[PDB]
Structure 1
Amino acid sequence: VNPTVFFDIAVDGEPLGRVSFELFADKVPKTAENFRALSTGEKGFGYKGSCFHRIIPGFMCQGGDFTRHNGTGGKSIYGEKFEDENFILKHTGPGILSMANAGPNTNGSQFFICTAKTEWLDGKHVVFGKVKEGMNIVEAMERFGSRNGKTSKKITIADCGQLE
């Protein structure tokens, strides 16, 4: 009953592979529904064509800024920012999907994919999903990041949507 969405990832326009995510709609329904709608684009805007603007190997891949493409933009289906829903789920290891924010109750559309267990983020960023298939593709994305987060090639979401 938990939805599954996919990202087809392209590197400088060349297809890399597909990542699918389980969204924990049972535990964080309002936040999950945000990510799901933005993945299908059914509200008229969302993630298709946007880039991963910050990739730090051994830490995380950050994306979701589809209005300014650099970490300063984005917006939710609920408006420009929505509340921290809960912190039931923790940052337990690689593959965790969590919301970026700018302080309490500032969730928009930016998210990150953890590539290591980030426990210091617990209680500060809302965890709402996990990589289901294609963790190897996230590992391949990592190799295009750097210590300061700048990517050496452009990593884009060429297509996305709902599988299940």
Structure 2
Amino acid sequence: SMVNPTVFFDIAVDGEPLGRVSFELFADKVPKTAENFRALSTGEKGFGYKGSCFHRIIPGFMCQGGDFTRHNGTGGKSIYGEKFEDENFILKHTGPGILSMANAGPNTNGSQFFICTAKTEWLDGKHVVFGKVKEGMNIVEAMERFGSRNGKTSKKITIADCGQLE
């Protein structure tokens, strides 16, 4: 992209390298939400995604992660404070690879996010879409296979490294 930043996650399975997933962040249309994810991926504010876990993976739906404060699926925080408002609903959950914010209801974005592995249109207007997988969808499909119907993973899937490319 000439405009949108690219970030990467190096994914690990029980500490072993699985592969790299890169993401285009739609700063052109969702700038505040894209900037939060970018800065959490570089760690430039002193905290962020490196070391955190994809704690909820449900095959056919999504891979969810990003709780680096409580490490139990209830936490996370943004670069703007603990939570920030839903920026816009311009983009929709149109298929595999969509990157969108997890939340606990309206205006509760922090750091948790999910990567869709299917179209999840029922989430439109309730979760802010802000990016998409650029390279490494095969790695996301590999992560998806470690999930289960209740979201518990059979091995621990972590972000071993992350940062900004280009």
Q: Provide TM-score, normalisation by structure 2.
A: 0.98
Task: Give the CA deviation at 1:67.
Answer: 1.2
Deviation of residue 133 (structure 1)? 0.2
Number of residue pairs matched?
A: 164
Q: Shift of the alpha carbon at 1:141?
A: 0.2
Deviation for aligned residue 1:69? 1.6
CA distance in 2, matches of 1:67, 1:80: 10
Distance 1:40 1:68 in 2: 20
SS in 1 for 2:9: strand
Residue 70 (structure 1) shift: 2.0
The CA deviation string for residues 82-107 of structure 1, in whole angstroms up to 9 with x for no partner, is 00000000000000000001111110
Gaps of 5+ in 1: none
Whole-Å separation in 2 of the counterparts to 1:62 and 1:125:
13
Distance 1:23 1:153 in 2: 28
In structure 2, the partner of 1:21 is 23
Matches within 5 A, 1:120-131: 120-131=122-133
Distance, in Å, in 1 between the alignment partners of 2:71 and 2:54 is: 8
The whole-number CA distance in structure 2 between the counterparts of 1:15 and 1:52 is: 14
Deviation of the 1:68 alpha carbon: 1.5
1:91-127 CA distances to partner (integer Å, 9 max, x unpaired)?
0000000000111111000000000000000000000
Report what 1:132 is aligned to. Answer: 134
Q: CA deviation at 1:149?
A: 0.2
SS, match of residue 52 in structure 1: coil
Overall identity of the aligned pairs, in %: 100
Residue 53 (str. 1) matches residue 45 (str. 2): no
* Deviation of 1:79 (Å): 0.2
Measured in 2, the distance between the counterparts of 1:9 and 1:68 equals 20
User: Match of 2:23, SS?
Assistant: strand
Partners of 2:68 and 2:90 in 1: CA distance = 28
Q: TM-score, normalised by structure 1?
A: 0.99
Task: Return the offset for 1:57.
Answer: 0.4
Point out where structure 2 has 5 or more consecutive residues left out of the alignment. none
Q: CA deviation at 1:12?
A: 0.3
